[PDB]
Amino acid sequence: EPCGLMNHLTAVCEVVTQFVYTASIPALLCNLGVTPIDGAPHRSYSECYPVLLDGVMVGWVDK
Amino acid sequence: GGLTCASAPQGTLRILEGPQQSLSGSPLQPIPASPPPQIPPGLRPRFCAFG
Protein backbone atom coordinates (compact mmCIF):
# COMPACT_ATOMS: atom_id res chain seq x y z
CA GLU A 1 0.00 0.00 0.00
CA PRO A 2 2.75 2.68 0.56
CA CYS A 3 4.20 2.03 -2.91
CA GLY A 4 4.99 5.27 -4.68
CA LEU A 5 4.15 7.30 -1.58
CA MET A 6 7.15 6.58 0.67
CA ASN A 7 9.96 7.62 -1.63
CA HIS A 8 13.51 7.88 -0.36
CA LEU A 9 16.05 10.47 -1.44
CA THR A 10 19.02 9.71 -3.58
CA ALA A 11 22.55 9.80 -2.22
CA VAL A 12 23.67 13.05 -3.84
CA CYS A 13 20.37 14.84 -3.15
CA GLU A 14 20.00 17.20 -0.23
CA VAL A 15 17.38 19.52 1.22
CA VAL A 16 18.21 23.24 1.26
CA THR A 17 17.95 24.40 4.87
CA GLN A 18 20.25 27.45 5.01
CA PHE A 19 18.17 30.65 5.06
CA VAL A 20 19.85 33.68 3.50
CA TYR A 21 18.79 37.22 2.58
CA THR A 22 17.90 38.47 -0.90
CA ALA A 23 18.66 42.18 -0.55
CA SER A 24 21.24 42.78 -3.28
CA ILE A 25 19.74 40.40 -5.86
CA PRO A 26 17.02 42.81 -7.21
CA ALA A 27 19.59 45.56 -7.67
CA LEU A 28 21.93 43.04 -9.33
CA LEU A 29 19.17 41.94 -11.71
CA CYS A 30 18.30 45.54 -12.59
CA ASN A 31 22.01 46.20 -13.19
CA LEU A 32 21.70 43.41 -15.73
CA GLY A 33 18.96 43.76 -18.30
CA VAL A 34 15.96 43.44 -15.96
CA THR A 35 13.88 46.52 -16.72
CA PRO A 36 11.70 46.80 -13.59
CA ILE A 37 7.93 46.87 -13.41
CA ASP A 38 7.32 50.61 -13.28
CA GLY A 39 9.60 51.60 -16.12
CA ALA A 40 8.98 50.52 -19.63
CA PRO A 41 11.08 47.94 -21.49
CA HIS A 42 12.70 48.96 -24.73
CA ARG A 43 10.92 46.24 -26.68
CA SER A 44 7.23 45.61 -26.30
CA TYR A 45 5.71 43.25 -23.81
CA SER A 46 4.96 39.71 -25.05
CA GLU A 47 8.62 39.87 -26.08
CA CYS A 48 9.52 40.11 -22.41
CA TYR A 49 9.70 37.41 -19.67
CA PRO A 50 8.49 37.94 -16.12
CA VAL A 51 11.12 37.61 -13.41
CA LEU A 52 10.05 36.20 -10.08
CA LEU A 53 12.68 36.38 -7.33
CA ASP A 54 11.33 34.03 -4.58
CA GLY A 55 7.73 35.21 -4.72
CA VAL A 56 8.38 38.88 -5.45
CA MET A 57 7.73 40.23 -8.92
CA VAL A 58 10.86 42.08 -10.03
CA GLY A 59 10.69 43.10 -13.65
CA TRP A 60 10.56 42.41 -17.37
CA VAL A 61 13.63 41.07 -19.20
CA ASP A 62 13.96 41.58 -22.94
CA LYS A 63 13.84 38.37 -24.96
CA GLY B 1 9.67 78.47 -12.55
CA GLY B 2 6.84 77.48 -14.88
CA LEU B 3 8.30 74.12 -15.98
CA THR B 4 6.67 73.79 -19.38
CA CYS B 5 6.43 70.53 -21.31
CA ALA B 6 8.67 69.30 -24.13
CA SER B 7 8.43 66.99 -27.13
CA ALA B 8 8.58 63.19 -27.38
CA PRO B 9 11.94 61.45 -26.87
CA GLN B 10 13.13 59.54 -29.91
CA GLY B 11 15.19 56.73 -28.39
CA THR B 12 16.02 55.34 -24.96
CA LEU B 13 19.60 54.18 -24.40
CA ARG B 14 19.82 51.33 -21.90
CA ILE B 15 23.14 51.11 -20.05
CA LEU B 16 23.86 47.70 -18.52
CA GLU B 17 26.92 45.70 -17.47
CA GLY B 18 28.44 43.59 -20.20
CA PRO B 19 28.22 39.84 -20.68
CA GLN B 20 30.63 37.71 -18.70
CA GLN B 21 33.30 37.08 -21.33
CA SER B 22 36.28 34.72 -20.80
CA LEU B 23 34.39 32.92 -18.01
CA SER B 24 33.82 29.63 -19.84
CA GLY B 25 36.79 27.91 -21.42
CA SER B 26 36.64 26.99 -25.10
CA PRO B 27 37.25 23.29 -24.39
CA LEU B 28 35.01 21.56 -21.87
CA GLN B 29 36.22 20.00 -18.61
CA PRO B 30 34.46 16.69 -17.88
CA ILE B 31 34.82 14.39 -14.93
CA PRO B 32 37.22 11.68 -16.15
CA ALA B 33 35.91 8.19 -16.77
CA SER B 34 36.15 5.83 -13.82
CA PRO B 35 38.57 3.12 -14.98
CA PRO B 36 37.49 -0.38 -15.95
CA PRO B 37 38.51 -2.96 -13.33
CA GLN B 38 41.92 -4.61 -13.74
CA ILE B 39 42.88 -8.20 -13.10
CA PRO B 40 45.33 -7.58 -10.23
CA PRO B 41 48.99 -8.52 -10.75
CA GLY B 42 50.29 -11.46 -8.79
CA LEU B 43 47.42 -13.95 -9.01
CA ARG B 44 48.40 -17.60 -8.68
CA PRO B 45 46.75 -20.88 -7.64
CA ARG B 46 47.02 -21.01 -3.85
CA PHE B 47 44.81 -24.12 -3.55
CA CYS B 48 46.55 -27.41 -4.15
CA ALA B 49 44.40 -30.51 -4.54
CA PHE B 50 44.65 -32.65 -1.42
CA GLY B 51 46.68 -35.83 -1.40
- d(CA A2, nearest CA chain B) in Å: 37
Amino acid letter, residue A44: S
Q: Identify the DSSP state of A54.
A: T
Instruction: Compute the distance between CA of residue B46 and CA of residue A27 in angstroms, rounded to an integer.
Output: 72
B16 chain-A contacts, CB cut-off 8 A: 31-33
Edge to edge, the sheet with strand A48-53 lists: A34-36, A56-62, A48-53
Q: Is B43 helix (H, G, I), strand (E, B) or coil?
A: coil
B9 chain-A contacts, CB cut-off 8 A: none
A32 chain-B contacts, CB cut-off 8 A: 16-17
The method of structure determination was: cryo-EM
**What's the CA angle centered on A37, arms A36 and A41, to 5 degrees?**
65
DSSP track, B5-38 = ------------PPP-TTSS-SS--PPPPPPPPP
